Write a protein that binds this ligand. Structure first.
Ligand SMILES: [Zn+2]
Ligand SMILES: [Zn+2]
Ligand SMILES: [Zn+2]
Ligand SMILES: [Zn+2]
Lengths: 208, 208, 208, 208
C-alpha cells in the first residue's frame, strides 16, 4: 500500500478501460483514496504515455502537488470520496452507451437483475452542470448517496467502489446495462422491468 | 479424459468466450459432465486469474468439493444435464444481444436458416425466476427438452452440446441470431421468417 | 502460382476475414479458380485448425478430391466462376450487417459512392433457396451477371473479384455499406441516395 | 522535422486509425504540411504495405513527385491547408458513424460538450460533390473556415489540427459524437442539446 504500487494500479486501470472499449482518447480519469486526499491521473497526458511519476496527489484541502496538473475533473472525485466514506476508488469515463443514455436524461431502470450491483433498482442520471465546477460536484455527491454509480447528463459516467478492480468492474457492468437499455428502447418504450420486490430479493442474495 | 485436461478446456472456453465478445466481467459459467456430476467454474474469481485447481466438482447429489465455492448458478447446469442426457457441456453467459432479446421476453423465430442448429425453428425464452433457485432450474429443464439453447428472461443464455467446442460454437451462433433479430426488429415488426417446411428441409440436411 | 501457394492464401483470407469481423464460427467459405475447377475450403474444420492439405480441389465436372469433403456450399462457387469468367476468387460469409439486410430482402441502393465498387448503383439480393442446391446456384449466377457481389436472402453474402485480396476487400466494403444502410434506415425510410447520373460519373472515374 | 520522420508519423497514424476502428480497407488518407506543400499517402497501396518511400510530396502548385501517385483525394487536403493556415495535419476517413450522419445530410448539434473541440456548437456537413473535384474542394474550404472538422455528404469526414496526434484525436472524437447522435436519434427526434450559452462557457474553459 505504497504510493508507487497504487500509481501502477491507476495506470493499469486506464489501460484496461481502453482495452474494454470504455475509454476513448483522453476522456477518462481514475483516482484512489490516499492518506488525507487522493491520487488521480493528470490532465492532458495520453494514457499510453503515462508513467508512475505522472500520477498526482491532491490533499484533503484540494492543494495539488507542485509541478503537476491534476485531471480537470478532480473536484467530483473529491466529492465522491466525501459523500461515500466506503469508496476507495473512482472511475470516470465517457463510455458511449452510458453517455447516450445521459443525453436522453434518463435513469436506467431495472431491466436486468445486475442493476442491483450499484445498490438499488436504478442507475440515476444527475443533472448537467459545466465540467470542473462546484455545481457539478454537488449533483454528483447527491446522486451517490445511495448508489455506487451515476450517469451525468450530457457527459458520461462515474462509478465508485472499494478498490479499483471492483470500480472498473462496476463501470463496465453499467455500460452493458446502458447498451441493453438503448437496444431495447429502440424497439419498445417503455422497456419491461423487474418489480421492486424482485430487486429486493436479488439485493438480499447479493449480500449472502 | 482426466480431470486436469477437462479443467483446462473449461478455462480455455471462458477465455475464448471473453475473446469472442460473449462474456463481460464475471458473468459466464461453464461446466462439463464428469463422473456422476460435473466440473464447473467457481464463483467470484475473475476469468484471467483462473487456474485448474479452481475448477469445482459437484457430485450428482449436489455436494460440492471441500474448500471451493461453485458458481452461484450451478443448479441450472445440473438441470440441463438431467434434462438432456446427450448434453456433455453447458455454457452460460449474459451476451448483450441475447440478453436484450430476453428483456423483450421474445423467442427468436426462424429469420435465418442457422436457427436449426439449436434443434428446431426457434430459440425459446424461458420465464424469469431469481438466479440460483429451483424455480429457475425447472423453467430451464422444460425449455431444453427439445432445444439445445434457450434465452432466460431478464438474464441471458444457456447453450448445451456434446462437447465444449460445440457448446461455445452454438452460444456464439445464437448471439449472432439475436443481433440479426434486434437489428431487423428496429426496422420492421414483424421480421420476415422462413416457413416451417423450409426449416424442415434444413434440419434434414443438417443430419446428412 | 502453385497449389500450395494458393492454398496458403485461401487460409490467410479465412483468418483475415475472422480478424475483420466478417466471419463468425464456421460460416465462411473461400475459393480460387484453379486449373479446370477450383480450390475451396473444406466442410466442418474450424478455420484455426486449417492446414494447406485440408484445401480441396473440385474439377470442372464437380468431382472432388478423394478423402476430402469440400464446403457444403461449393456449388454456388462453381456457379460464380461459370457466370463471371473474369472472377478468379470467391468469398462467401454470413457477415451480420449484410445478412440483416438480406433478411429484409432489400437491395442496398446508392447511399454512398463506394457502391460503384461492385459494378453498378446497387448491391442486389437474390431470392432464398436451400443452401447447397441447384436452385440457389441459378439465383446466384443471375445476380452476378452485372455485379461482383450479391446478398442472398435469409443467408449472407457472396463477393467475387480478380484475386483474393480484392475479393476480401469488396466483401468488407459491402459489409460497411450494409451497416450504413441499416443505421440510416432505422432513422429515415427511405434513405437519401445518389442519382444514377452521379453513380455514372463515379463509375467512369473508377475506370480512370 | 525531416521528411523521413514525418513520413513515419503519417504511416503510424494510418495504422492507429485502423486500430481505432475509423479506417476500413483503403479508405483513409492522411497528410502533413511540409515545405511549400504537403506529404500525403499514395493512392492504391494497402496501409500495411506502406513504407516511408511510398509517401508523396505535392508542392504548392499541385505538382506531385515523379513516379508516385498521390491519394485520389489530395485536392481537398490542399484546400484545407489554404483555408486554415493554422492546420498542419489533415486526416480523412470514411468512419461508419460519421458517414451515416453524412448520408442523412445533417450537422451534429451540441448533444455533448466535447463538440466544442472542433471550434463551435456543431460539426457541419458540406454538400456532396464528386470525389477529387474542385467543386468538392470549395465546399470543404468553406466548411472549415470556422470549424476544424466537417462531415462530407454521402462520403465521410475531414479533421484538421496542429499536428497528426491531435488531428487523429479529433477525428476519433467526432466519430464518438456521430455514434452518440445516431443512437439517440433512433430513440427521439430531435435530440436534447446544450444551449449556446453553455457551449460558450465550455469554449472559454477549453482556452484556459
Ligand atoms: Zn468527464
Ligand atoms: Zn447468469
Ligand atoms: Zn452460407
Ligand atoms: Zn474519401
Amino acid at each position: 500500500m505504497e504510493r508507487n504500487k497504487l500509481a501502477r494500479q491507476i495506470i493499469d486501470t486506464c489501460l484496461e478501460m481502453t482495452r474494454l472499449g470504455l475509454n476513448q482518447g483522453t476522456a477518462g480519469n481514475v483516482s484512489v483514496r490516499y492518506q488525507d486526499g487522493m491520487l488521480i491521473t493528470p490532465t492532458g497526458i495520453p494514457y499510453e504515455k503515462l508513467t508512475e511519476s505522472h500520477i498526482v496527489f491532491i490533499d484533503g484541502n484540494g492543494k495539488h502537488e507542485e509541478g503537476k496538473l491534476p485531471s480537470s475533473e478532480w473536484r467530483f472525485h473529491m466529492a465522491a470520496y466525501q459523500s461515500r466514506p466506503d469508496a476507495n476508488a473512482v472511475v470516470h469515463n465517457h463510455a458511449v452507451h452510458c453517455t447516450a443514455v445521459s443525453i436522453l436524461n434518463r435513469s436506467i431502470p431495472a431491466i436486468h437483475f445486475m442493476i442491483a450491483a450499484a445498490g438499488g433498482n436504478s442507475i440515476p442520471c444527475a443533472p448537467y452542470a459545466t465540467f470542473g465546477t462546484r455545481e457539478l460536484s454537488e449533483h454528483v455527491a447527491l446522486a451517490l448517496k445511495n448508489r455506487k454509480a451515476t450517469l451525468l447528463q450530457h457527459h458520461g459516467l462515474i462509478a465508485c467502489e472499494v478498490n479499483l478492480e471492483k470500480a472498473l468492474w462496476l463501470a463496465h457492468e453499467v455500460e452493458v446495462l446502458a447498451q441493453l437499455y438503448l437496444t431495447t428502447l429502440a424497439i419498445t418504450d417503455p422497456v419491461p422491468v423487474l418489480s421492486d420486490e424482485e430487486i429486493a430479493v436479488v439485493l438480499e442474495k447479493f449480500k449472502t
